[PDB]
Design a protein around this ligand. Structure first.
Ligand SMILES: [Mg+2]
Ligand SMILES: [Mg+2]
Ligand SMILES: [Mg+2]
Lengths: 66, 457, 66, 457
């Protein structure tokens, strides 16, 4: 993600979800987002397989006693 | 002949297990060029398994409950020594599985004989088993029509008489849809009942595994064989075995049985409505019941499915998007692009939904709905019409299934044959509360006994 | 989300996450995305309060027996 | 006085609960204009609660374990009849809470006396309690410096001698950071130990609640009072009470205690390293231990926090972003805009991480790390240097805390006073495996007994 790609994304994503951003606000949002993107990139280095599951999986109801 | 008679024939010495195996192999050889249900035939394994059952019988042993019964599995199940395809070409180069899926191991321990791996929509995303890489699976009742999906091979193999039992998966409908469209029996157990270990996943939060079969007894026997905790499986919540076979014939006296309305009527065509009506009459259900927030339940399932399934394949979407199934790759990509707010909202809604569904089942034992809005459309269908509303065919097949699996309630899909419908079948969902699979199965058995639910063989 | 907002979002988001889309594929992706946006909109109609939690919450280890 | 002396003094009749209450109120009156720890002083309630304890004593009743102890709570805790602010101006129009938070109810049942609500970073997103709407909370040891955060009122009220006990929250550090920076005791219990019911949330997947105190006994007594299952709280997994008070003085003979290196040394300044060194020597720990994937653990916590916290506030971010805290509103917005793939990856990584952390604690009873990279910076600081490397001040305060709360391990934050540090304190984390709070507390008690961990004026 280059800085120019981040700026286009922040603008389009904010409009899509309904958060109105003036230009100074969009730049401040992109500054934080850029730091987070480096964190996410590090997370992508961890080898996960398709069967590496979510930490919590749905429980539809307690299993009954007997 | 059905599961029960096959098992009896081997137990009693009327037929050898090896002869039963060779008959299934010859049927596959003769029919599968057209049906295209199988992607791999485990011939050497099948013959050695059948041989081993005949050795045990000849020694005078008591045989296990599925001894000699042929079966096949959707090709997302790991089969030792075989590369798990999950309907993809991407997986072809992965190492062969080191072990059978746990459910395969349990069927093997019960004496069942594995004949091989079955066709599916790539990576389980689809309801029609129109696979671009492997070819479509064709409905044995009319080979110009779809078998349904994503477990289409699992349904077709049973309706073509190739095997009496198969395994499939169901996230948003993929056992129930082919059961409906092929006219065979299916069981989607409670979410977290049956171990998912050694299977290729789609949606960690929603995937279920279960049997399809030639009879309701087939479902119950296979389900009992497969049950049990698996501490190595993150999704499993069942802490003990709750056998269904001993009570299968107990009947439905005193149960509160209702018919779902609203969403489940509005999205049901005339044949689907007639199937529910006749099943309701047979089961003594007359009250119309509203399922809580059904359309929103579908919506939330849809959102979670697309993001979790798409993101699972993100690394491959980045480097080899052209190697995916062209009919679903854009749906996977859409899923990856979904705002994280939609995912979180769906997960928060799911708590509310679980509470409302569990509350609904404090007043009801079984609820009835159709399995699919219509019977099998033609292969290559882009759009269907349901009570005057147009839908894309591929997503639309799961309109009635998707709200129910999201709550994780168990369902038997019972095959029925409504009158005004070109001789094609349509299934009925018999839905019970979490952990109450044996109620669904009891209701199925009543439909089977009266002749309302059946195969056409 | 208008069709114009969806186009801009699909384009910027696909670039940001590393799945560049050719014009015909971007149109196909937007078609599916638009259908999903209607579903998400329906989810937004459900009233949730801040204390409406996720269906599954983390468990750091099994609680020890005694 | 300190906690134990207050409780004993009231139990023995040497001092009344009402007199103890009035001393705390008068200290608040004299000091809080500058420290700015309190947002709400529940004067009438405090006096009534203290009076009720004195009545029970005069009736000959056996007093409960916290009888007469004054406390205050971070203003994300519901207090009956008061609007829960959670550091925001946005919440000012919400209805007053209909009941106390469950933890407040439990402290009240134990005899403790509530003095009111404490300042915090808005919506709990921040480590400095530099609140634009309510003003900063100031460090009582140097009022030009931060108290830390987000539970800064909770730390400052104790270091200023206003109350002996407070409640905070800790998602990624927010109990441990103010404990460190104010030189007081903190306990972040195991994730899922203490009920979150009746509190304003931040991150459903990571929020913890816990006490800060004037002594390690204060921690243990308050913790024991607050423990217990709460079936109405979705996050609670504790099925029974495990008292820490009876074993607090058991000591550490035979325990395996290690010192964390790598990430926990590289992100520790000279004072933080000296504090760990002296704590290690006192506790007999010499072996350097690597925490698994610490930097990635931080990353994943950071990702999940920003999306879940931001999406929680989405409706307000849509219509009134200008009414949020200027120092954090753009971070909440960034969180809402994060691709869903980052969230899902972090949740999948969290399973791997949980496994690795639990495996690590098969070899260790307690692990030691610094609580913060440095002591309290000046109010208004944007950038800090840690061993010559720059970081943004606000996120940086949690560098050493954030990996540990992501695994949900319990931590005592013990206050120490290193040399060549302008007389400012810095905390040490005593980290144990999930559910092993009483080991952390036993280790803290050894530090307290030798005089290494203590408060100051
Ligand atoms: Mg477009
Ligand atoms: Mg290209
Ligand atoms: Mg006296």
């Amino acid at each position: 993600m280059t800085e120019t790609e981040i700026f286009a994304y922040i603008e389009a994503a904010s409009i899509a979800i309904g958060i109105p951003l003036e230009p100074a606000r969009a730049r401040a949002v992109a500054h934080h987002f850029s730091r987070t993107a480096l964190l996410a990139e590090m997370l992508e280095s961890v080898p996960l397989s398709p069967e590496s599951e979510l930490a919590e999986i749905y429980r539809p109801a307690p299993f009954p006693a007997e | 002949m059905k599961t029960v008679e096959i098992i009896e024939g081997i137990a009693s010495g009327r037929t050898s297990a090896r002869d039963v195996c060779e008959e299934a192999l010859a049927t596959i050889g003769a029919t599968d060029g057209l049906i295209n249900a199988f992607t791999c035939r485990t011939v050497e394994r099948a013959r050695a398994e059948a041989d081993a059952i005949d050795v045990r019988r000849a020694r005078g042993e008591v045989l296990p409950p599925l001894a000699g019964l042929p079966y096949a599995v959707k090709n997302l199940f790991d089969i030792e020594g075989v590369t798990t395809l999950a309907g993809s070409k991407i997986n072809r180069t992965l190492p062969p599985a080191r072990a059978d899926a746990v459910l395969v191991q349990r069927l093997k321990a019960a004496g069942a004989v594995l004949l091989g791996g079955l066709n599916m929509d790539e990576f389980a995303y689809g309801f029609t088993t129109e696979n671009t890489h492997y070819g479509p699976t064709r409905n044995p009742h009319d080979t110009g029509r779809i078998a349904g999906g994503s477990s289409g091979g699992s349904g077709a193999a049973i309706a073509a008489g190739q095997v009496p039992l198969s395994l499939g998966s169901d996230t948003n409908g993929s056992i129930r849809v082919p059961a409906s469209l092929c006219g065979v029996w299916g069981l989607k157990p409670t979410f977290g009942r049956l171990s998912r270990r050694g299977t290729y996943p789609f949606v960690h939060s929603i995937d279920h595994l279960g049997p399809l079969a030639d009879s309701v007894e087939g479902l119950a026997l296979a389900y009992d064989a497969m049950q049990g905790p698996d501490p190595l499986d993150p999704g499993c919540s069942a802490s003990r075995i709750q056998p269904s076979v001993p009570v299968l014939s107990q009947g439905i006296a005193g149960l509160r049985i209702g018919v779902l309305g609203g969403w489940f009527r509005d999205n049901a065509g005339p044949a689907a409505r007639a199937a529910v009506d006749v099943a309701a009459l047979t089961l003594g259900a007359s009250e119309v019941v509203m399922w809580p927030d059904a359309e929103i339940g579908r919506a939330a399932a849809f959102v979670i499915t697309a993001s979790e399934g798409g993101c699972l394949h993100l690394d491959d979407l980045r480097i080899r998007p052209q190697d995916f199934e062209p009919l679903s790759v854009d749906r996977f990509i859409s899923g990856v692009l979904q705002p994280v707010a939609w995912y979180l909202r769906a997960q928060r809604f799911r708590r509310v939904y679980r509470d409302k569904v569990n509350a609904l089942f404090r007043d009801w034992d079984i609820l009835i709905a159709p399995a699919t809005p219509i019977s099998a459309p033609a292969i290559g269908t882009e759009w269907i019409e349901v009570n005057g509303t147009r839908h894309p065919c591929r997503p639309a097949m799961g309109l009635l299934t998707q709200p129910v699996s999201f709550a994780g309630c168990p369902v038997v899909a019972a095959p029925t044959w409504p009158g005004e419908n070109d001789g094609m079948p349509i299934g009925v969902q018999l839905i019970a509360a979490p952990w109450n699979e044996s109620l669904c199965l009891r209701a199925g058995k009543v439909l089977q006994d009266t002749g309302i639910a059946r195969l056409k063989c």
